[PDB]
Ligand SMILES: O=C(O)[C@H]1O[C@H](OP(=O)(O)OP(=O)(O)OC[C@H]2O[C@@H](n3ccc(=O)[nH]c3=O)[C@H](O)[C@@H]2O)[C@H](O)[C@@H](O)[C@@H]1O
């Protein structure tokens with residue numbers, strides 16, 4: 001039943017993977033070279049915004065199934081299966097360094113699992129690195145490198161790990177590959193007690209799958225954003241079109257919400273990576289280039305509409321911003337559309353009052369960096385603790401991230417605060433007709449505006 | 455519950471819509487101006503390849519719920535709801551001709567007494583319902599109604615099933631009093647389909663018009679997306695079918711319409727994506743993604759010939775290729791935009807001899823390919839069509855699979871071995887497992903996967 005596992009990288013993917021595998025009964029050693037992070041974890045803290053994770057870590061540490069250490073040798077000796085879950089910042093040196101440490105110390109068969117999102121062909125480089133360490137030692141030790149990508153969503157990662165749609169395992173079919181596949185089967189057995197959730201394939205195809213999946217999700221979004229722009233010209237309603245096409249089971253209903261673009265640390269990075277490596281291989285990915293181009297423009301749509309409505313010089317104007325994080329339920333600001341919007345508005349002289357239920361501190365940090373070259377613009381940026389207060393004296397309210405708290409606001413209270421009842425909605429939260437009936441000039445994406453907007 | 459309905463257009467969308475609405479108890483008048491077609495229908499004949507249709511027609515003629523006539527005034531007088539289901543054939547310009555829908559609209563307005571719901575059922579560009587309304591009001595002025603968009607989501611060869619068990623019914627109606635009146639009539643009309651599960655989606659007219667194009671555009675996008683990744687899979691040494699399993703297993707993406715191959719055809723996808731691209735360009739918007747999907751599909755239709763040239767050389771004089779599949783998809787004789795037409799033209803242009811087989815599309819293929827290649831009678835002399843699938847492989851350098859008819863999924867390699875010159879297969883639909891092909895000594899070249907060892 002229970003196996004000795006090591007997770008390399010105490011980051012987000014690594015922590016959730018390690019904690020949840022400990023939670024099904026495996027004995028897990030989480031390695032990170034950063035003593036500070038390890039210290040934080042061993043003092044019962046959690047460096048990430050991840051519901052349920054602290055309590056999973058806590059109960060498994062107490063049960064003796066989860067340990068946090070910087071001790072590389074102890075990590076190699078512990079784990080029969082070694083998950084490489086280290087970052088790949090804008091660079092594979094860390095996954096390759098992890099691989100070399102396994103090769104330099106291992107004394108028996110190892111399954112090395114590439115769990116971090118890595119380019120196709122990485123498993124072969126990991127294999128070469130481990131092999132060369134073994135050749136220095138003269139040892140006969142055998143091993144196999146497996147690709148097992150992550151499909152977690154920030155802020156929902158514990159549930160996504162615990163009830164996955166599928167588990168993708170790319171393995172070789174030679175003798176060590178089959179030995180590794182058997183160990184992976186045993187490792188994930190508790191997830192396969194009902195429907196089979198594991199999908200086995202070759203290593204290169206598993207590596208490609210992760211990029212292809214995110215690329216298709218991004219493609220759905222940019223597809224709808226281009227059609228939203230066309231709906232405006234046609235006098236059509238993209239939300240009606242969304243239900244109209246999503247109701248074909250071959251299309252499906254999810255990931256078709258037009259709005260102010262996709263952000264995060266996944267889609268832009270994985271789409272761009274796939275475009276770049278295809279180009280390096282002599283192929284221009286026409287659809288993915290278009291998807292990326294559409295998204296770049298779409299992240300400017302809110303400010304463009306604001307300029308169309310109010311003029312190029314926004315000095316003397318105030319805008320309330322609802323939503324900062326790149327999506328609901330996280331404090332993550334990476335590639336957040338709010339950052340592009342706020343920079344654009346500040347550059348034109350506007351004042352900005354911003355609200356987000358959880359992301360205020362991170363937004364303050366990163367926007368101060370974004371606009372470090374314009375300290376005077378930052379003097380016009382404030383953050384408020386209550387959503388309605390952002391609207392005080394505002395010429396318009398701008399919705400960027402569809403946090404639930406924004407879905408049924410107190411428009412009466414808003415009416416007593418704002419200068420003019422104007423809403424630009426990058427996430428289509430409200431019915432236009434309802435906004436009309438409430439005296440709000442409503443500017444959604446791809447839908448007829450309220451009558452005041454027209 | 456029974457209403458009196460008129461269907462204008464005794465073509466494919468019209469015949470299925472008319473016959474199946476009669477079948478749920480409505481009294482249907484099917485109008486068409488072509489007396490020859492009306493005759494074939496009243497003689498118990500049916501102009502199209504459509505399983506189950508003839509039986510449905512026969513039953514409803516007998517029940518007195520289905521009539522066929524060329525009588526316009528009778529048609530307009532019968533139909534409280536008037537479905538416009540006429541064709542929109544291309545022009546030399548390649549845009550859809552609306553003349554027949556507007557001619558139908560005008561006729562309604564010329565003879566109509568009392569309220570009418572005019573339903574645009576054939577696929578038409580956003581804004582067509584407004585042109586129809588104006589044309590009807592034009593005719594009324596000389597002498598109350600509402601125009602509704604109710605797009606069709608049928609699949610040739612499965613139209614009766616698709617109509618009888620729809621995923622959804624889209625109804626686009628106006629917000630005013632005539633529009634509200636039409637909406638209630640549409641609800642009553644479709645009541646039997648919503649009896650146990652609500653299947654109707656109501657929206658405004660222009661959104662319903664747009665929905666039809668948007669749906670087909672997304673389907674085409676999924677296919678071109680996978681075809682571009684298939685070409686990349688070759689460069690990476692990955693397997694596009696493994697990638698399909700790996701991404702389609704995310705339910706936000708879903709498992710359907712992710713089969714890479716030799717491209718999409720038919721009279722719907724290329725027409726509807728081209729129509730979106732063109733109309734958008736005419737409003738000063740470039741649809742970057744749809745332009746890329748159309749471009750990749752044009753390139754994908756060259757891939758099989760490309761592989762054949764890579765394997766045998768640029769001059770195919772003295773080569774013979776067997777082609778399995780001609781129709782644009784299985785279960786139809788429809789040759790519109792078929793990948794087989796481009797492949798066959800490219801191979802013949804290089805000197806090859808071609809022997810082609812399809813379970814039902816041979817006559818249509820001969821007709822349409824003779825038109826395609828009318829300027830090159832010497833190429834046409836090198837094309838023949840065979841009535842048995844194995845016979846196409848006689849003296850063939852390679853077999854090429856273009857359309858995944860079920861029959862091809864279980865080849866008799868002993869029969870093929872008694873016939874072909876070299877055991878080489880180019881597969882544009884990925885029907886077989888490359889390892890299995892290796893076991894059978896077949897040199898196998900699929901799309902986006904490593905082939906057999908012999909390959
Ligand atoms: O590679 C990863 O680790 C993860 O990347 C994404 O997860 P994430 O980026 O956290 O969140 P999403 O919910 O995918 O949102 C991405 C962006 O798309 C936007 N979006 C999403 C859906 C939609 O319909 N429209 C839309 O604009 C969101 O607002 C957000 O800015 C994927 O959803 C996960 O499956 C994948 O595991």
Ligand SMILES: O=C(O)[C@H]1O[C@H](OP(=O)(O)OP(=O)(O)OC[C@H]2O[C@@H](n3ccc(=O)[nH]c3=O)[C@H](O)[C@@H]2O)[C@H](O)[C@@H](O)[C@@H]1O
Pocket residue numbers: 606607608609610670673677710711712713714715716717718719720721722723782783784
């Ligand atoms: O507008 C219409 O009347 C119809 O158009 C298409 O139906 P159709 O073109 O008859 O047939 P499809 O099964 O959609 O096939 C279209 C093309 O895509 C190709 N295809 C399909 C699926 C796939 O995964 N890969 C792929 O290449 C097929 O071989 C074919 O050439 C739509 O599927 C229907 O929903 C729509 O009602």
